[PDB]
């Protein structure tokens, strides 16, 4: 494939709704502490508190709603 | 087999005919005149399974193949010619053309004009099916 992605961080701001067929993935809007102007929408599985920090592998791809 | 023009001073242009239907996708790349072409690829070229012909995956594999061919030959920039099924059948573009465009743009080539060359008719003949249509 020959594709290399840099390590990306995150910072949650406000909680949102929950997606998934059984409600296991939770929407949350984030900010990047590396560059405090870009905000993307992602899904997180697991408990999330506001004021926490998330780890990623890439921050260039967004996810759909269901399918 | 190469572009004698310097890449920093100027960039060269070809066109591509992204034809996407509900069961196939084509990526066909030629120059501005369009008489002769660079290379061609279908939706079944990279996937042996027929069920996977109409998908983003065959489109992005086709886009990567023409991306490598245009990188090795020396064509840097491409114009866009999107195409639906056309005629009297369907005026809606397929769900693989956008992924093909994303894969062809994310690989580091310059874009040009984006124009739809869908063959819109004035009035064609009768559509396939019956009076009651393709009911199921």
């Amino acid at each position: 494939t020959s594709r290399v992605q840099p390590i990306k961080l995150a910072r949650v701001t406000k909680v949102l709704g929950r997606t998934g067929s059984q409600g296991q993935c939770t929407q949350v809007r984030v900010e990047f502490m590396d560059d405090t102007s870009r905000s993307i929408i992602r899904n997180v599985k697991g408990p999330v508190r506001e004021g926490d920090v998330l780890t990623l592998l890439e921050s260039e791809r967004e996810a759909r709603r269901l399918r | 087999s190469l572009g004698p023009q310097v890449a920093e001073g100027e960039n060269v242009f070809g066109v591509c005919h992204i034809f996407a239907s509900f069961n196939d996708t084509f990526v066909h790349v030629t120059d501005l005149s369009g008489k002769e072409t660079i290379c061609r690829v279908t939706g079944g070229m990279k996937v042996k399974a027929d069920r996977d012909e109409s998908s983003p995956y065959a489109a992005m594999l086709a886009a990567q193949d023409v991306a490598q061919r245009c990188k090795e030959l020396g064509i840097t920039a491409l114009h866009i010619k999107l195409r639906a099924t056309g005629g009297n059948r369907t005026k809606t573009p397929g769900p693989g053309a956008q992924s093909a465009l994303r894969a062809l743009a994310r690989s580091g080539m310059k874009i040009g004009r984006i124009e739809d060359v869908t063959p819109i008719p004035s009035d064609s003949t009768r559509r396939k099916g019956g009076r009651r249509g393709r009911r199921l």
Partner: protein
């Protein structure tokens, strides 16, 4: 029971109109009876707009649109859930729904 004031169409002074064909099927429907959607859409919906913006030779290039209209039979329209049904007392509302986005 007379269900509607009109008869599912706008044929009030002609008697015969021209038939057209659907998109999901090929069912012949009269023109004033069918439910038609003049959809407006762009080339890139929401994903690669920044990709097109950065990788363009033309600076601040405006993205073109695509213009298309679709024809629906009633069964194909309700099967695609474009239009739904309500109460007969609220059936007498000719106003389109308020488009927010």
């Amino acid at each position: 029971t007379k269900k509607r004031r009109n008869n599912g169409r706008a044929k009030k002074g002609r008697g015969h109109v021209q038939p057209i064909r659907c998109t999901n099927c090929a069912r012949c429907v009269p023109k004033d009876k069918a439910i038609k959607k003049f959809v407006i859409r762009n080339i890139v919906e929401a994903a690669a707009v920044r990709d097109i913006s950065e990788a363009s030779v033309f600076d601040a290039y405006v993205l073109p649109k695509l213009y298309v209209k679709l024809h629906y039979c009633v069964s194909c329209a309700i099967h695609s859930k474009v239009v739904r049904n309500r109460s007969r007392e609220a059936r007498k509302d000719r106003t389109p729904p308020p488009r927010f986005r």
